[PDB]
């Protein structure tokens, strides 16, 4: 029910969100960023009819959805790749400066 | 058993909260705000009786009740219209500083 | 359903009130017919907030009448309808 | 099984019966007034080859309320369509006073 | 629920169908790979009330039977809201009534 | 399985439209075998991302062909397959 | 009613059938379109006084029943004796056997 | 489930049975009268040896399957496999079927 | 359960019944017909006192359990733990097995 | 088949047994690497004529019984009488009684 | 099984908690603060045993409880008053500075 | 009900604690009847918080005397009720 | 308790049958094709003494798609290994076009 | 599914093995403290696909045992698919066929 | 399921955690610090095989593991001792400067 | 009970490994009794973490010697007991 | 159906049973003190045309504490009040000590 | 618990009720469009305790039933806690005993 | 229902029965070493109307370890406690070695 | 599992109690408003564990049962692990075992 989506993880700054939307034109999809708290609406402004001249069982239904996730401040974006019906949104931030991961004691 | 409550989402700034109160008088009703944590009390302070002089099936029910939701800081108010039992309050706050939407790699 | 109340002043007089929030006066338009009052209520805007930003959220009425009605006062004030009618004279 | 029945008011003064009654002729329906209360002549030996399955086959009553009347009855595509006319009640009068 | 439907059987040439479509206009109807296709579309018709007309014990259907090939039809008609097709045809030259000795 | 969506244009043409996402060319193979259509979907790279960053997340078809079909267009475009197929001419 | 089957060869078929009281003029065979229908329907009934009789076994009813062939099956003599039909079909050429 | 009898009542003295023995030869079949008690035996004398595999169902099938003094038997007739066995005693010297009043 | 014996039935007029009865002396077992009506008693005259400790299993044990007029008896034979017994009487005068039509 | 149990002694174990119709043909006992089988074969059969015989209690039945012996138990004495089969096993020196 | 505690919630700056500790010596009780996130430890030192020199049934049931809570910063203490086996202990803190509740518009 | 705790020092005496938390020197009145002692707590005042603020949060006994009672000390100590008790004396 | 039968399309043209046949020898077993469908002479009185329980024990059709042949059977290790060959659909051809 | 298998029983001296291994080659089995192990593990086969070969009705098994000291082995013959072993062992001193009286 | 952990509660500054790694060589063992959130990551980098020469139940499974645990901030680690299996670390850090326990009224 | 992993290196050899986490040597002491191994490990302090502090958190054993065991070697590593045992001969 | 009973004590020298006895009238009542425990004269056949249904119909021990007493009794609207007087258990007394 | 009452139907134009009120003041109770409402209304009584009187086996009520018009009222009897009250009205010119013919 | 019987070894040279019979005196019991396995006089008629109810009423074997031997038999406080001794298994050598 | 005992009932004056403690010691026992109290107590006894002893079929009890007044104890007798407990006292002047007429 969920559309198709996963996350990348990439490193301690970056992290990747994989995208599957298949048929949507670019007019359609909006993204929308509101206090580090990433929305994606994809809309069919186009509003494709469901009409019987012939046309049989749709199994891939598409319209209208919306999606949000509180991210961790501040986050940016760095690219976005529209390849074969897939988006690979590329998002890289986090500076903690305490990385270190070597201590021992015999 | 919740009262019939409405929120309304307009912008990144902006969220406006819908109110059924029909019979309440304003000496009743009473707002707080402790902290961005909003506490709305309506409380009945003439405490109508339930008489049986003739009354008869009393569905709608109203005496004292109390709400509370912790607003993301440091929400300040905008209007407050009290229209035929309804009141649409207009909280709007929020300076992140980056909506930017777009970035494409081909 | 709207939420309904109904009182009696005296054995003269029903007097009923109503939760209709959000309701205007052209949305509201009543008829009595066959001894018989019906309020209806009626949506005079397709009711379509822009989907886009807001969605996520949680009629007729017909009632028989003891012959012969006198219909009083209807005050719509605060979101409130509150109808005052008349009925007795039973000659006993 | 029992023929599909709908019923209407258009206003205070109009009933409106709508039947389906199909395969019925005009010399086989009959109806009748009686006590305020609204209600085959030659049937066939069916040939079992011919008539395998047939997916169709080919009296009933509602009290009026005081004192209903006939106006217009029409036979159109199979259907059945009667209107009724009846009022007076003395009492059509909508009132409302204040702000 | 979909409308009811009689078949009469006729010979083994003829097969005649009895469909039961009362109130429906000869404009709304339609009839079309030796498959029979008998579509009832709503062209211009009203739009139901909640006020005015309320309860009831009609839309739009389609139907499809794979019959042998290869069917032409013979007569439609319409009356008392019946439509009574004909379809005739058939010669498989196996007919045989017949078998008997002691 | 993937999801699968089905029109006629008219009886000539039956047109399949189909969501293979992350599919790319040399992984689809199609095949013509005794009149039934055979599309394949084969990895060519085993899929192993680098387990200790990335785990946690959320085939073959045929069917009949009804004499004689004849192949018009086959698009694939933003992760669509959009196929047009054409068969009637039954004589009747 | 009870039935019972044989392949003589692949030639032949042979149907053996138990019909017992039924009339001449009752029984009927069709080979239509390449599919067998056995009718056994009585043509009239018997003067049967509910006083005396009492748990009556046998059901008697008329019954149609169809068997689709594999094209294209043929009759070759059917023997009426014992009480039992006895129906010889012919069909095979399928250049493979 | 047994094979489907029917007994005929027809007077007091007399009672007939008719049975159904569809493709049942004269030698397999016996009937034996023993102390007033009637026996009818269907005796198959050798079963048909015969295949299973051409012969696709066998659900029915042929195997092996107190009277009032001082009973004897009128007739027994055989054809198309059912059998009319006619018995005629019973003598009570009363049957006699009156008697009314107010 | 009781123990497990077999009615050979020989003709009309003669019966024979079978009994188990293994390990059973014969002054413990006796036979009696009264009022045309037989009955065959099993009586233990003293139960072997064995203990309960050294005899294991003791599941299967030893403890003690109307004609037609005029029944004679003809054998009684005692071997090996098998009682075979020989009736001979039923004379109804009509055991006539004959009769058949056309 | 009804089976009963003795030990007599240390020594002794006696098995007494119900066979009745049993012939001596029939029976045999083998003492095969302490373990004791002992056999009831009837070696063919009696004719049968289902008519007039009746419910047959008796499952007349060919058995093989099987126990495995504490090393090393040995035979006595088998006496066939009344239709009684009472087996004699002698075995102890356990230096434990 | 909660030992019985209440929460006495005073004004926006100050929440009292009410305490039911009957036979408890303050030698035994031990209060902790680390981080803004309260615990109360009640710890019998003297640890009292269960002895049946002629002891009867022990429905009241005491020896060593913990408890925490996650206080919003920067909690101090106001008072804490010893009467009767109860502990009335007053937070006092929360300066928001927008406790403002009044705007209308018609 | 409040909660009890039983104890005998000897055959002498019983000796009950109970937790009475909140409980103040009016509000317990005792009383002995008919050899059974009645421990009454009732309040004094109608315990009323303002509801507008607080509002969210989570009586008689009668036992029977085994002639014959000799009250020995009662403590109102740190929301306890300490009661020793003393019978014995059944000359055997 | 038939034996157990496994089916494979090598191709278009050449289904392959392999069967599990163990302790069957060269003259019990005989193929069929009849109507174009594909489908122990001598048994033994067992010695109960020596056979306590075998757990082992020792007619299948297939309707063919018109019009299946015969390539190569073969009995090795137990199993029988049988090559049909059949095609002529006159339709082998794959088309697509379009960016 | 574990593969299936008799067991002949000659003497007291020897019991033979029949095991079903159809498609198995002379290097993949292996036979092996008084117990036999008869192990077939695959050393060169083929892995399945699911596009040309697909549905069946064989991989490796291991199989214990634990006789009676102290076994060997006489003679395994690879006929039909069938691996028939003999074993040949055992002298108890007790296999008296015997004891009689009246 | 969960391999065998322990997690050791010091003081308000301190937390030690205690760790059961039998079998794990140092070279397969990797800990991450990412935000302050600890990622322990346990990785068979031999990646020994469950081959049956002669092999028999193996109870005790072990391959590759992922665990996480987000942490106030801003966490230091101050000893790590492997001895016997086992893992001690010890990390410390705190500073409210608000650890009062004592206040009185009667 | 601890987690035990059992494997032959060959007909002669069998080896146990096994998880004792936080065992010391003085902790664990073996029996050898009747052709049978007894590992026997019993805490020689009452492990007892200051309650006030720490709280929430998440034997001996038998296996018959199948005459005649020969003991290699027993090793005390990283929380891990790795006994090599030796036992074959059967003249056969 | 036995009637609804209601005991009481005043206070330790006051029981106090109130009784509700609808239609029942002087005579027919009759109570009895027995054995250390408190314990319709001529009835009617009712005609079935005006009695078609009463929706009310018309022995009771309860053993006493030593040792009870009579006070008053009294019929009013119906009901039965009696009082009853007993105590002496010479102990009345209320004792506490400390702070 | 509503209390219980019985119904007495003297004639065709007469209905005398009897209710059952214990302890009712005629004060505390009121009789009163063609419906009959007896109402039992507590004006001047005593508040119950849980500490002197505790178990029982009386608050206030109201009854309501449409009458054929046009009722009136004609003797209320307040006696042993029972009211009588006797409702005196109909005339419906039918009330013929009778019809009988052979 | 048999009495309760507790069995525990000291070491591997030392097992030890401890059994409860209570009311059984020393010429009742009677105790046998049978084949590797270790294993009322005169009874009463009980008087009804003294002996309402005992709540108390008054052979049993296991099979021993080769070869098990007796020490010493104790009746004391209405038990029983048997000492056993046995042992030469040939091997009660402890073995360790490594870092 | 609390211990199993027996009660004895000599007389109306005598109730004779049989208490079955095994392996207890005569310091640890302790027998005490007529009311018994048979108290059984360990004072000095061995604590168990699970490596040398395991697997049993002995803690401290008490017991108490309300005589009618005013008993004294006789004789407590410590045999076979056995206590036999004699209590002697009751005069009720009515032990009367009388009355038979005609």
């Known amino acids: 029910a969920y559309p198709p989506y996963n996350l990348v993880k990439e490193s301690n700054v970056k992290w990747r969100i994989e995208m599957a939307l298949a048929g949507w034109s670019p007019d ?10 990433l929305l994606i609406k994809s809309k ?50 986090i500076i903690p400066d305490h990385q270190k991961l070597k201590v021992y004691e015999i």
Chains 1, 2, 11, 15 share one sequence.
């Open 28 to 37: 359609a999809v909006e993204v929308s960023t509101e206090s580090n708290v």
């Open 44 to 93: 069919a402004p186009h509003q494709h009819t469901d009409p019987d001249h012939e046309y049989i069982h749709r199994g891939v239904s598409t319209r209208t959805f919306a999606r949000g996730f509180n991210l961790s401040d501040d986050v940016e974006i760095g690219k976005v790749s529209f390849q074969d019906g897939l988006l690979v949104i590329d998002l890289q931030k």
